[PDB]
Design a protein around this ligand. Sequence first.
Ligand SMILES: Nc1nc2c(ncn2[C@@H]2O[C@H](COP(=O)(O)OP(=O)(O)OP(=O)(O)O)[C@@H](O)[C@H]2O)c(=O)[nH]1
Ligand SMILES: Nc1nc2c(ncn2[C@@H]2O[C@H](COP(=O)(O)OP(=O)(O)OP(=O)(O)O)[C@@H](O)[C@H]2O)c(=O)[nH]1
Ligand SMILES: Nc1nc2c(ncn2[C@@H]2O[C@H](COP(=O)(O)OP(=O)(O)O)[C@@H](O)[C@H]2O)c(=O)[nH]1
Ligand SMILES: Nc1nc2c(ncn2[C@@H]2O[C@H](COP(=O)(O)OP(=O)(O)O)[C@@H](O)[C@H]2O)c(=O)[nH]1
Ligand SMILES: [Mg+2]
Ligand SMILES: [Mg+2]
Lengths: 47, 45, 427, 428, 433, 432, 50
Amino acid sequence: GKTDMERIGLFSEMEYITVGDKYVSQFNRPFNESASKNRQILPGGSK
Amino acid sequence: EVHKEFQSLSVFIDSIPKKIRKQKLEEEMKQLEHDIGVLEKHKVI
Amino acid sequence: MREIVHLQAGQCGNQIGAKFWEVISDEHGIDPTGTYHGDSDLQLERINVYYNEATGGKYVPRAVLVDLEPGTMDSVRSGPFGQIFRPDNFVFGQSGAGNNWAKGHYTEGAELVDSVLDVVRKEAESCDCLQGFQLTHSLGGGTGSGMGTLLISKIREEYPDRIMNTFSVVPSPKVSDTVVEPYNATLSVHQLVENTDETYCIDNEALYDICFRTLKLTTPTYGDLNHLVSATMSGVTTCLRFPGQLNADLRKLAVNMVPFPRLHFFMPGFAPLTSRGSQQYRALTVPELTQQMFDAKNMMAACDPRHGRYLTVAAVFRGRMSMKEVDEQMLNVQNKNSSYFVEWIPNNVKTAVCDIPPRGLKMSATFIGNSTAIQELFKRISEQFTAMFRRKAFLHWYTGEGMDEMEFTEAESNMNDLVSEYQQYQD
Amino acid sequence: MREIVHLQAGQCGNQIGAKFWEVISDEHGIDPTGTYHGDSDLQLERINVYYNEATGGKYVPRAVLVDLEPGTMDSVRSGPFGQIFRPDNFVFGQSGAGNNWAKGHYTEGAELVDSVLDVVRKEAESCDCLQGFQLTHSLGGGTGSGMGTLLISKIREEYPDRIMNTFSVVPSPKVSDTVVEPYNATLSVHQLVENTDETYCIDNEALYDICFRTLKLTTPTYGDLNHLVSATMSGVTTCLRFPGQLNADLRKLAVNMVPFPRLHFFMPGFAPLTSRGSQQYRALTVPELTQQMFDAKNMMAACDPRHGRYLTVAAVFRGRMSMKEVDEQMLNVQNKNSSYFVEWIPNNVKTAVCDIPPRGLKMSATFIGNSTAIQELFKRISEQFTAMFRRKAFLHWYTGEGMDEMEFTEAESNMNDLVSEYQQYQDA
Amino acid sequence: MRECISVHVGQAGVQIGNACWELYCLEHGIQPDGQMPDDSFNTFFSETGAGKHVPRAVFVDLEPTVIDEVRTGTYRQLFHPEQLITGKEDAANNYARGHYTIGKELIDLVLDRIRKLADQCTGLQGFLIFHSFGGGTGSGFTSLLMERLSVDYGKKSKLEFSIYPAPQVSTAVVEPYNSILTTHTTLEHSDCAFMVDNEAIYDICRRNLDIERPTYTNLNRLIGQIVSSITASLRFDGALNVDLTEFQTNLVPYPRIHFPLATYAPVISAEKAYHEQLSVAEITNACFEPANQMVKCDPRHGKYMACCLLYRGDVVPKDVNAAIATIKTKRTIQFVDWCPTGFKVGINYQPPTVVPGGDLAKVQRAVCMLSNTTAIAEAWARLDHKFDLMYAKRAFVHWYVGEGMEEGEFSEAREDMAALEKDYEEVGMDSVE
Amino acid sequence: MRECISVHVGQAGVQIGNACWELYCLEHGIQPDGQMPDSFNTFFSETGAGKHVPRAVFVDLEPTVIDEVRTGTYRQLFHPEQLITGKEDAANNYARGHYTIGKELIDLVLDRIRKLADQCTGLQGFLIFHSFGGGTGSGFTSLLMERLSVDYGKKSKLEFSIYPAPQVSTAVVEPYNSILTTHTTLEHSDCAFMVDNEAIYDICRRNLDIERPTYTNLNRLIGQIVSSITASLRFDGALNVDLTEFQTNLVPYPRIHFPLATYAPVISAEKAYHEQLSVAEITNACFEPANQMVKCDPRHGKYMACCLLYRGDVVPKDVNAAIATIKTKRTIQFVDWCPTGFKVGINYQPPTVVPGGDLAKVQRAVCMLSNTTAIAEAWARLDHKFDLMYAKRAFVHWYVGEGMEEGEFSEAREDMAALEKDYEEVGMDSVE
Amino acid sequence: QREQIEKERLEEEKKATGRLQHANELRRQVRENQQKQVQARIATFDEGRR
Ligand SMILES: Nc1nc2c(ncn2[C@@H]2O[C@H](COP(=O)(O)OP(=O)(O)OP(=O)(O)O)[C@@H](O)[C@H]2O)c(=O)[nH]1
Ligand SMILES: Nc1nc2c(ncn2[C@@H]2O[C@H](COP(=O)(O)OP(=O)(O)OP(=O)(O)O)[C@@H](O)[C@H]2O)c(=O)[nH]1
Ligand SMILES: Nc1nc2c(ncn2[C@@H]2O[C@H](COP(=O)(O)OP(=O)(O)O)[C@@H](O)[C@H]2O)c(=O)[nH]1
Ligand SMILES: Nc1nc2c(ncn2[C@@H]2O[C@H](COP(=O)(O)OP(=O)(O)O)[C@@H](O)[C@H]2O)c(=O)[nH]1
Ligand SMILES: [Mg+2]
Ligand SMILES: [Mg+2]
């Protein structure tokens, strides 16, 4: 059991956020989920 | 343009140089108002 | 004759109303200084509504600016159209109402409301007839939610026939710039519901949607987010500032759009919005405005109007248009998409048409709809309160300025009474 | 006027669709800027079929382009006629579809489905009367067969009264570019049976064969073959955009050529197909055209038309001409090879003459045929599918995101029902 | 108009202040003789007509060996000669001397000067009291200063930039004794108590800033950038301006619980600054990352109760909200149930300045995460074990009882922690239906 | 935006990437410091003014080859955090790269993998480069892979690996831990191309006349494969084939995921000037049972899915009549449950050249990729060598010493036999 | 349209030259960290000489 000074060299290996979550991508989000669902309010065009 | 600077001061006046800077923007325009008057009421020079 | 006293309060409001005094400034011609250097005569005809008049042909903005912190006075004064205002309307305070509804409504805010009303009296009295008031604030802040609701209540007692409008910045679902934000919003809406005539709800996330999805701006600041709110601030009041083929003033958009008295939490939207490259590829005819504005992506509230029924709608159009096309589409929108409108009201449209278009654009319109989807906006602030109130959250502040837990019970319950009546007429 | 919404989908569809807006612009006088500068008038009174109005006298194309990758669209934009389409009808996703058919139909294509639907309906309602929709794609592809069948399952359920024309490149025997291609095909016909009404199947085989053998075009690219597809895309619609003495539109071409509801699989074809050297050595009189349009070489499909019989023929002719000729020497075809025709309808030929010829050419005639000898386009994929599905072949992607196993059996059972349905009247 | 008087108690406080006050005179033009070579210096400097920007601070130690360098060093002409009040004998790591014996003669003189620095201010925003948490005067005289300020000032912001003892590094053998005694009496009069230990700084300025052998001089420069970001909205202007009282309703749960943490984001060194682009997304991930936490209490082993973002520099405000939402999708950063919210944004416009001969790099962006974590209960329980391991046989007490302090206060100090332990254990639970 | 996070592990992996990253630096205009004098995209990131950041996670348990990058000519391109060195090697030991010393670095490198991923938007997946047999290559790769899948989920993992060479090995344990790393790179490995050591020496002997070059001359040949296989995520052109395109078109049943590689225009300066490299000859050189990169006769097995990644002036008809001609010659046996068996991808950019290298310039190139059964004989020449150790208990006390249960070797043996019989029960022809 | 394209173009260059000025002022920080380390190496070797 090597000590922390011998381990990574730090005083303590305070473990990391970025070890235990899935990559959901920061590709730009369309905010609300209601931006895309069914038929929206469509008035008539000119004739 | 000296009136543009005077209206750009803060609403509160609470420090020694802000008193002083308002006063140097006070007398600079006051000596101009006395001067705009003498050159307005006398058409001939 | 009708005149509108613009009380703007709260860091947000003091900024989301300062742009209004730059857009209306340009709409009527008034330039930075305050002189009128415009073009048409109409620009300087109903200037009385928002602008007063000072010797030297200078129209001073009829606007009282209120912020308990004297720091946003320096921000609004040092702006582009910032010297235009008059100094005695800058009724500032000494201490900070740091994000707490109590120190705007009960403590330190209370010792400014007396000094605000005297200024409010001054602008109101020196006037032939008042149309009403208008408060531009943010729900979710200290001086906005705190004093602003109190300032609504005092002027509602004093002048109890005037149109009390308010452009409120409602909290957002996705992100929070404040962590006592569900507290301040829930407490405030209690005062709004019995003391206001039209409450326009504009929240930041919806402005984020419009500025990237439809406008395509990679760097939207808190300045262009206020430009869109100023456009719909201008749009509601344009048939009493400019002529038209069919006018609708502020009280006309109050009688015609509130079915039952409490149904005044509204949701706006600006019609001619194009991106930077799609502006030449896109036409300018009336059908283009009407489909873009009733659309859900151009909506200034987060609450999607397609999970609800339109109780009432207006489209205050602005442009040299034909009234029949601005009649047939309002018939077409009520016949094809005739399941998302209510049936106990046959027609749910005020088709206001102004003549003078905004600057640059040849047509425009401002959506105002009393949808039943507004309950979703208020519902969300209710679980965000009761999740906090249950395990009694930051209250060691809120009780400490001198209020009681009884007020928190009634503020939530009156807001729960509010959301049930939006569902009593939704089904 | 009568309006057609285009539905560019797939890697092929974005390309052969772009070639359409390069040919139909050249015929209608539209320029890459978008401002009309043509010489005649008749290319202007029917702009309102493919080209919508914009301020400035500008004619923006009506074309929603869809793809699950950036990919093709960056090339479509950065191209010769690529400064025409709306920036918001260039709708694209990012992540790759990767030729997995179910990925483009039951996953990621199910996020892009509403965004392309939003553009369609926005472009659909803003018309006087739509004549029909027009989606071009691949049966063996990625963002084509996967996403396209989803688009031709969602715009017909909400407009069930409108024409669904589709120019669809079918898989081939020999010219192969992908390995799971007959999986994608046999799974996409099941949606192109109950929905599409005017499916012009088209190969890649003869598109090479028309180029390197007939045109003497030395190196067939991916580009010059699309110029041939755009030719058989135009001529079908040329009686409803350009004047004529006997006009026939898409519904005209539907009713007089599809006998049973499930005969909506068709066979395309040009007519003055030539070379660079033979044109001075030849004459484009209409007696020639019939020989070069009822043959097998000028056919834009791989399937041979002498293994079967044409149930019904149509010939949308184009140019200045008489019609003793193209009515009776067209009737001579009905009499001379009566072996390759049918008898349960007496005449199986519909003529349709335009007035204005193609740009350059003289007396062209887009040849569309409905044959039972399209069957080898529909069984050779089926034998290829059964050879793979026998030992449960490349399916660990196809079953990964949701498609079950009897779905594959239905896609071959509803295939071989249609295989027997064309052979039910073959023997005759 | 917005003033913050800063009393720095102890050797740790004044040496920290020697890094904070050199930074403040670099942001504002302020030559080290207090003469500018507009109204943004009125939080940390006063003003006379000649041009003397006298700093609003009062330095106190009972040992005249660490403020006499201020009266002889290059920053002497700035500080008012009388604001630096030294003692004659130190408390010498004995809470009893600094609070009851050797601090009682110098408590009136310091409090009289804090009178004369608040008459001069229009509206006092709050206090910024920098001290240590293991020393004698950093614990004792600080404790006497806290309780007696709050009987004449009353309700006023009293923020607490302390130096908490490290988990296994210590420079004193009696640090656990002074630890318990000064957070037993400065817990009822304290509004925020920002803890920063020593070990996490050592690792932070070795991991990110590739500087082995760091000294106390480059540990306090990081502390300067903390307080220059907390007091950034007051001096300088921007969107969503966020003040001291404005913090102290958005970061402090149940009135016992007032101990937030501090993390700076763009702590990247000079060579790695090229080999990075820094947008708001990765700097707001740096704070929530436990490696850039400036306390050796592990934030992953707890739940974030209130979390206050202080952006500073070129941060376009939309990209803020996109970056915030990603952190709410991560399952590793865990938030409590009684905050559906839990973010407080603040956007200052002027970029982070660099101290010459400083170890940090020049960056356009900053975050000062003030997060109120449940994991600081780990920090207290560690030296709570240390207290109950020496007092079991009453080790270092004859120095304490022999300086005018009863031994009952020790047991009172222990049982006050057991409440504070219990509170941080009580709050974190999920309310079960 | 498209991107790929390469990570290179072991002495083999580091310098394989070093020639690869040198090659990736010369297609794009990138200088060795990283500053040009919008396609610099997948294998480069751009920060601020001009600095071009690679997307590698260079790693080794021993400091030696990594600090050569620190002191070499590519010192101001790679980061001081992108090059993650260690303390001591695993030393040809699967137990000391996966349980003791490999465990000691795995948390730090997953951070650098993840922090490198958060500037990315649309990753197709990773590019694990290693060698089967060399300790860190066997150990750390297995440790990296197991935690990679359970964290990153379904992302395309490519495993360009060194297979143990059939005749000679520069290791005594190379048929003793390659069995072990096939126990892990079998269930989280989506497609795992190999180049065993010997045949690439034979490739640079017959075709390239160059006799007796050093280590680096075969890594440039590998880098050309890496460029062409990751070419349509990059430089524009015709029909384009990405990482996801591969796995639906190369690998059969979920455990067939060990394809081969074969470059085509592996040609010297003198060859190029007097033999024309048109599409017709080039597409056939891949199917020669002497030009293919793993030293195993491809005639003994059947090809199951062939994907020909072309490059350059590769006009479409020329590949397309050609692919028929490969289906006419009968020595290449194609399995009858896959009749198509052929994918095509056409890029437009010419094959690049290192300024100093053999690899003469040519306008067309092919990166042949197939699932042949004839890689099983290489696994038959490997597994029996492992049996010849384990029967009389070879180097076992220094595998159990750093922690390893004894039955792990039997477990790796039986999954190895399971793999072996798998490719034959799928390689039996369709019988009614 | 075109009038604010140039305003949008001139806003891109001032951040482009803002980041170029960033890189150059950042370029002054590693060569003062280089000269500090170089002089320390000379200081150690001259300490050996003395
Ligand atoms: N971060 C940091 N910590 C310091 C510094 N100087 C002292 N300390 C810490 O302060 C602790 C002791 O508190 P001090 O206020 O310095 O005590 P003192 O004034 O030296 O002596 P006493 O009169 O007994 O309090 C030590 O454990 C040090 O770790 C400094 O410059 N920076
Ligand atoms: N094909 C091929 N194999 C190589 C090359 N370089 C090294 N190898 C293989 O790599 C192995 C050497 O060990 P590495 O995988 O590099 O691992 P390492 O970094 O040395 O770590 P330890 O072996 O544990 O000390 C040998 O078995 C070689 O077969 C190369 O250039 N080409
Ligand atoms: N639309 C808009 N919203 C703003 C603006 N300024 C602040 N906000 C919002 O207002 C909320 C903060 O309210 P704040 O202004 O601090 O309230 P106050 O302190 O009482 O004045 C935040 O959620 C911001 O998103 C602005 O200029 N425009
Ligand atoms: N004629 C022609 N066909 C093309 C072109 N590009 C691709 N294809 C065809 O598209 C089919 C492969 O489709 P694929 O690229 O997988 O489409 P996707 O899956 O929708 O992306 C093949 O049959 C090709 O013949 C082109 O430029 N011209
Ligand atoms: Mg001391
Ligand atoms: Mg090694």
